[PDB]
Amino acid sequence: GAAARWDLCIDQAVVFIEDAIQYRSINHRVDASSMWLYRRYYSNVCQRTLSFTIFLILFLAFIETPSSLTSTADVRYRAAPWEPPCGLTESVEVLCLLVFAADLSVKGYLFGWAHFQKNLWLLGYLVVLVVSLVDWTVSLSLVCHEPLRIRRLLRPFFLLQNSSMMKKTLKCIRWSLPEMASVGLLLAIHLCLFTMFGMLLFAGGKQDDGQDRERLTYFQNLPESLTSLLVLLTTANNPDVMIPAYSKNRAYAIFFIVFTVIGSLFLMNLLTAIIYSQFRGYLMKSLQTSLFRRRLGTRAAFEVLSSMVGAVGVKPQNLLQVLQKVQLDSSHKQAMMEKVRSYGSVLLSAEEFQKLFNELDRSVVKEHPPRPEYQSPFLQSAQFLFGHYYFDYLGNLIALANLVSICVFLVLDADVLPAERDDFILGILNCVFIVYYLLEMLLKVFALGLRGYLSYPSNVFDGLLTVVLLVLEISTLAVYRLPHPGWRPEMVGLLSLWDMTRMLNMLIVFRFLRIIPSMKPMAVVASTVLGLVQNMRAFGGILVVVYYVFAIIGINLFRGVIVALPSAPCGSFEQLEYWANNFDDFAAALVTLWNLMVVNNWQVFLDAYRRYSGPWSKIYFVLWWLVSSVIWVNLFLALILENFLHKW
Amino acid sequence: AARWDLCIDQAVVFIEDAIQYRSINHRVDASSMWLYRRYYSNVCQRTLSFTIFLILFLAFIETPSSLTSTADVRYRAAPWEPPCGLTESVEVLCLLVFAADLSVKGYLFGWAHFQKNLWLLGYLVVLVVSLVDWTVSLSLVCHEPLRIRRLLRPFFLLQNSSMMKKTLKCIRWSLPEMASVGLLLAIHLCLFTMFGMLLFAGRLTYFQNLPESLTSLLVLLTTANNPDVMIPAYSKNRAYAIFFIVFTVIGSLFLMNLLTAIIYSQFRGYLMKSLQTSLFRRRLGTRAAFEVLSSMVGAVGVKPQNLLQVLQKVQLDSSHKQAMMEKVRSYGSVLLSAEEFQKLFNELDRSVVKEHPPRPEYQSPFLQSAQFLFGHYYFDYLGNLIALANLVSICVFLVLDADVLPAERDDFILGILNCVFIVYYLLEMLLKVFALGLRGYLSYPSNVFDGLLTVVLLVLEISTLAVYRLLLSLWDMTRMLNMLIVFRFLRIIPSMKPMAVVASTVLGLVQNMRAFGGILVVVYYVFAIIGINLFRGVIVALPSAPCGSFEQLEYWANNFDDFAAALVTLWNLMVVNNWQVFLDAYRRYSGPWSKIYFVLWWLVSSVIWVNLFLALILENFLHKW
Ligand SMILES: CC(C)CCC[C@@H](C)[C@H]1CC[C@H]2[C@@H]3CC=C4C[C@@H](OC(=O)CCC(=O)O)CC[C@]4(C)[C@H]3CC[C@]12C
Ligand SMILES: CC(C)CCC[C@@H](C)[C@H]1CC[C@H]2[C@@H]3CC=C4C[C@@H](OC(=O)CCC(=O)O)CC[C@]4(C)[C@H]3CC[C@]12C
Ligand SMILES: CC(C)CCC[C@@H](C)[C@H]1CC[C@H]2[C@@H]3CC=C4C[C@@H](OC(=O)CCC(=O)O)CC[C@]4(C)[C@H]3CC[C@]12C
Ligand SMILES: CC(C)CCC[C@@H](C)[C@H]1CC[C@H]2[C@@H]3CC=C4C[C@@H](OC(=O)CCC(=O)O)CC[C@]4(C)[C@H]3CC[C@]12C
Ligand SMILES: CC(C)CCC[C@@H](C)[C@H]1CC[C@H]2[C@@H]3CC=C4C[C@@H](OC(=O)CCC(=O)O)CC[C@]4(C)[C@H]3CC[C@]12C
Ligand SMILES: CC(C)CCC[C@@H](C)[C@H]1CC[C@H]2[C@@H]3CC=C4C[C@@H](OC(=O)CCC(=O)O)CC[C@]4(C)[C@H]3CC[C@]12C
Ligand SMILES: COc1cc2c(cc1Oc1ccccc1)[C@H](Cc1ccc(Oc3ccccc3)cc1)N(C)CC2
């Protein structure tokens, strides 16, 4: 059994090295079959399948019984959505839940039973799966007649369970929670004290006066004063809340000013600073944990390989075979194996082993495939001329000319009648510029080779853009037959292809926006954008979870409360025609929650839902303002600060 | 001879500069040292600060007099127009004070330093321009509409504050990146305008022509019309919302906070750098004083008797001065070395804690329990509980009397409860004074605040009981009493620790935010004066309005007819809410070319209010933690 244990130790070294490369903790059980199961489960295919299943189970909310498949979200104009049959979404959800159960079983087998019991995330996964399956069985025993599906609230949790960055962000929020709670208590005391002071201050005065008007409009009773001051805390009705009092007497504004100085200025920014105080070393801590995990992986692999000899160390042949069996990029794998081959038969110690496995911190520069060579001197000279970077200068100049022409002929044509436009010069210029784009793409492909041209991301991007523009232009020319003087390119019922062509042609500006890191001031902005996109998961997952949970709650609460009866106050929900901001389906719920995250016109929604669904509904919206506009927006600002100050 | 006096006076002034963290570039002569001590005295600095305050406050009583009860154009009475000579004589007195200050600054420091210092050259230029403008405005009989000299007033404040010169130096360093972010935001606006004009106009309300599209997108950038700008399109099709959403993601959320990040990247170690510079100045001052005292002797060292004479002359806190003097006495007649001299002046960093006077020391058997109970914080918690009960009673009587007019009925029970609670407050104050002594009780700022407020409450309650129950109405004096009780309820914040820590943090932030306050004052002053010069009499109440217009919302009080109304209008514009209402109003009244002023105000005001202020709060919060 010596050979069996030898190959088992080789497999242990391989899996430990793979964990070190992928920054995975070494806590899973190491067995003959468990190693194969671990390498199969953490493969790219299985992880992509799990992520797609999570995406599908989140996307099912768009196709549930409150279907989100209508052209418009306005209550007045929306038609009945396509209601899916009972078994369709239930079957899709049950297959997603079976996939999740398989994933949970694999996770619970790869790790120990003790680890599964001790881990709170796996216990929560099991509880959520059991509750979701029970709710699905209940909702299927009745024939899709359960109005509220609690399982839909637990769908975001899966997204939390399969993301380490999301869990780190949640932990940072948890750490920031006590100071935020203390500041919130102070702010509630502030709100209550100013509410009582306002109610007592605007109580007197003559009838129909400015002070009496202020009392009637905003500070009549305690809940209305509380709502008014809470909205003023978000500065959503800053002039309206004080216009009557400020017109009655000039000094009253002082009061409101003090409020905005204390509540909206000091305490909200204090909350922002508190939330940022926990994301202060986010990226640095993540890098430190990644390096620590890599070091642990390499150390454990060395320790495993050392026992195979029984001085301590790893034989070069065993390390070479392990590197041969390790899933790694070609450059790093080849460099590491050549460095191992450089060592003779002498055993490798732990320190030199770790220094060898420090080669994985090298950012390999991928060389673009060489351009094909042409024997003809004229052909190769033309290839050199067209492959020169000054050709990109000429292309950018022509692109700027195209963009300026499109903008000018859009501004000019806004004044003239919609049916008397000529669009001849603009059509000719667009045709010429699209032909030039096609010629430039063909020349670049000729000079750099098809694979070489497609190697660059900017080159493939502009190639796709010019292909789409060429298709649109050819279709337009085929429909409208070679523009002439007075060539109207818009016809009723012809999809308005001209507008689509000009809108896709306005994506040219990326040719100039992608070269902004050239100037020094824009370099830090570009670095911040890149870091925020790389760390997009940290805030994006929290955003998705919050929006999903609150959309489901709103649909369960405010499904059919806003109905237009077949005169309204000037500042009301009906007069502004906000009927499209309802909770009748998932997309409308998401748009309404977005419009509420932007605290503007918050009191309009508050009053509308107080009148339609009840006075207590405000609580929900208040919670929304606490969860999205206060916690998540400050989280995004903290991540922006961290990504800006990381490199700098 | 007199050289000994000169040396000891130079040592005294150097020690004072080290204590106050000032430079040593000032000339040190017999007369110059006396002038330096007089000029940097507390009296002269307070006088200069008050003169700056007065010259800034004169804008409230200028020709557009801000002396009307209301700011509504419909109801505003004719303001009291001051005579021609009054505010001109006050301003010329302030300018003469500033000229004296500038001459003293140019005399104490070298003429070469004055020539090389750009701030002093700017001070001289501003003073000369202000005097010329004042003479011109006085040659005419106060008939110059625009006073250019009024725009240069805030500079005086800016010239006197050293903290503002550093917050401006940091803003100057952050300007190259804020300019790039502004260029990116302008590109964002232009691209989304030229895209919406194709998407929607190809509508009549928000994206009809180029100026309307630009204004609509800029307002959405400030999120002042977020649902309104999208309702006409989001009603036609859901996907259109995506467009606006993308905008709000790119401009309002990302770039407007990238501005905050850019500003904070410069204030990252502002407090630490200031502290290091202050310590360096203190060390340099102590070193210069040591060198002077060593030169006085005639090895190198400070004679302890000379050092005691210097400390005697030095204006310093009694505790630190006595500690240093007794340390020098303990040194005896031994000559002090350079390192010992440097380490001697570390006593000022001891941060001496103020002690409280002892308890009255009454008899034990009869009053020991009383002393223990009243001195204990459980009595303070009982007082807080009773204050909360008073607050609950006020809330109950507000809620029950909300349906009817609060002034009508149901105030007898509230009156009795307030009388009982004020009696309890008086009893608690008397018991605390008994347990701590009058000077002991007044030592604590919370205790003196509580005592003052309960004295005011008792006076008002007794007056109301005597006059009515048997000038102001009964309801007005009940409003005053209830508002004073609500204000008194603030005592619960220092007591409760979770609120007390946050209150202390907020107070420390306020104490360190004076540079932000000065910058805000400068910006508000300049923009208010420009708005008065531009939009003075444009908004008039014609003797029907659209539902969401300037007239239907009755925003008439937000005008620029006077300085206070200008300040309130600039405040209401700083809070970007309902920005489009003012934009449309002044477009219709003052002409199309008025959005430039409001856009410049939005930039200069939103930066200060959101990004610079958040950067300062971040720095101040992280330094303490
Ligand atoms: C942030 C929000 C706005 C994102 C929403 C994304 C999707 C949920 C939306 C975007 C556009 C919508 C589509 C717009 C138009 C139509 C055509 C519509 O066709 C009809 O016959 C509608 C009813 C009718 O008019 O008769 C069916 C729904 C559908 C596909 C909609 C389905 C839901 C979509 C994909
Ligand atoms: C924390 C809370 C509970 C107390 C502190 C809140 C402050 C914002 C208060 C404390 C004193 C208040 C002031 C007390 C008295 C007056 C005079 C008052 O004058 C009139 O109403 C006279 C004209 C008329 O009644 O028609 C206008 C409000 C004002 C300035 C108040 C404005 C609001 C102030 C500054
Ligand atoms: C900074 C944070 C911590 C502030 C949190 C404030 C909330 C605790 C306040 C603000 C608005 C308040 C609400 C304002 C109005 C009402 C209606 C009120 O009911 C009525 O108006 C009575 C008539 C009826 O219910 O029909 C019940 C309390 C409630 C929900 C309030 C509950 C407490 C709320 C959510
Ligand atoms: C941020 C802003 C709101 C601060 C404004 C502060 C001052 C410029 C204001 C606050 C209260 C005002 C006072 C309120 C009431 C009066 C009584 C008023 O008496 C009248 O007879 C007015 C005309 C009339 O009603 O007949 C004269 C102006 C005066 C002192 C006003 C002068 C200007 C004051 C001091
Ligand atoms: C991120 C920052 C740097 C963006 C700055 C953008 C400004 C330079 C733009 C945005 C809004 C623009 C304004 C939008 C609308 C108008 C009205 C427009 O009016 C007309 O000339 C047509 C109507 C008429 O003449 O009656 C004149 C230009 C102006 C002031 C524009 C001037 C340029 C402004 C201030
Ligand atoms: C530099 C900038 C200009 C690039 C990014 C701008 C985006 C906000 C644009 C680019 C493509 C646009 C989309 C192009 C086409 C459509 C289909 C369009 O469909 C209809 O209007 C059909 C139904 C109807 O008209 O009733 C709705 C807007 C939408 C999703 C657009 C939404 C806004 C988008 C995402
Ligand atoms: C291959 O092509 C180029 C290469 C390089 C540049 C530019 C190029 O292309 C153009 C040249 C001229 C006009 C248009 C495109 C820049 C110069 C540059 C700097 C800032 C700019 O900022 C904007 C201007 C307008 C709109 C948006 C941003 C734009 C260009 N160099 C400094 C580096 C290499």
Residue numbers in the entry:
A (entry chain A): 37 to 346, 354 to 609, 620 to 701
B (entry chain B): 39 to 240, 251 to 346, 354 to 525, 537 to 609, 620 to 701
Task: Copy text verbatim from the article accompanying this structure deposition.
High-resolution structures of mouse TPC1 and human TPC2 (HsTPC2) were recently determined with X-ray crystallography and cryo-electron microscopy (cryo-EM),35,36 where they showed homodimeric assembly of two subunits, each consisting of twelve transmembrane helices, resembling a tandem repeat of a 6 TM helices (6 TM I in N-terminal half and 6 TM II in C-terminal half) observed in voltage-gated ion channels (VGICs) of the Kv, Nav, and Cav families.
Interestingly, VSD II domain of the other subunit in the homodimer does not show such a feature, which suggests an asymmetric binding of (S)-SG-094 to HsTPC2 with 1:1 dimer-to-ligand stoichiometry instead of 1:2 which would be expected with a full occupancy (the subunit with (S)-SG-094 will be referred to as subunit A, and the one without inhibitor will be referred to as subunit B). At the local level, (S)-SG-094 triggers several side chains to reposition, creating a binding pocket which is absent in the 2-fold symmetrical apo state structure. On the other hand, SG-094 binding to VSD II induces a shift of IIS4 helix toward the cytoplasmic (i.e., C-terminal) side by one full turn, which results in Y480 interacting with I551 (R3) instead. The cytoplasmic shift of IIS4 helix in subunit A and associated movement of residues M562 and K563 lead to the stabilization of II S4/5 linker helix in a closed state with an extra helical turn on its N-terminal side. Therefore, it can be postulated that the binding of (S)-SG-094 in one subunit leads to the closure of its binding pocket in the other subunit, explaining the asymmetric binding of the compound to HsTPC2 homodimer.
